[PDB]
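Case 129 in the screening queue. Each case pairs one protein sequence with one candidate compound; here the compound is emetine. For every case the pipeline is the same: read the inputs, emit a complex structure as tokens, and attach any notable structural observations.

Predict complex for case 129.
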Amino acid sequence: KVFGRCELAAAMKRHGLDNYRGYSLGNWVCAAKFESNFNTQATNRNTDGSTDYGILQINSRWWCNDGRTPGSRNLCNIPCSALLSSDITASVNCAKKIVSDGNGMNAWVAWRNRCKGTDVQAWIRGCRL
Ligand SMILES: CC[C@@H]1CN2CCc3cc(OC)c(OC)cc3[C@H]2C[C@H]1C[C@@H]1NCCc2cc(OC)c(OC)cc21
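Case 129 output:
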């Protein structure tokens, strides 16, 4: 599923991301834009053998099991395929654990490099939320 901007903002808000760990909703929408271009089915293979899955490109070395990431953990206790669903619940629940790992949303390098310090509220303006 390719979410619309405002559609995804609404779904993230219903699942509790607005101001989660202090990050306003626009930060989450911006991160999804530059991680996945709002495409729940996005995957990207890393040179180290791990794979990033879904709307927030969550990585298999620590956070989900895909059965092909040597030496990995599964700290969100989910199959990585669950992060590709049109229902974003599993991605949101796992993202909540990630943003708690001490680096906040710097855990998403695309957030740090492309969203951090910008007018992220522009991502939710004009959205019914
Ligand atoms: C309501 C307008 C969209 C919302 N903004 C949020 C702020 C923002 C920040 C960006 O980088 C930090 C950014 O980079 C790509 C985009 C945005 C936008 C996205 C807006 C515009 C919109 N995106 C989908 C379709 C489209 C097509 C466009 O031209 C064909 C266009 O021209 C300006 C804008 C957009």
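Case 129 observations:
- The first strand starts at residue 43 and ends at 45.
- Residues 1-129 form a domain with the Lysozyme fold (CATH 1.10.530.10).
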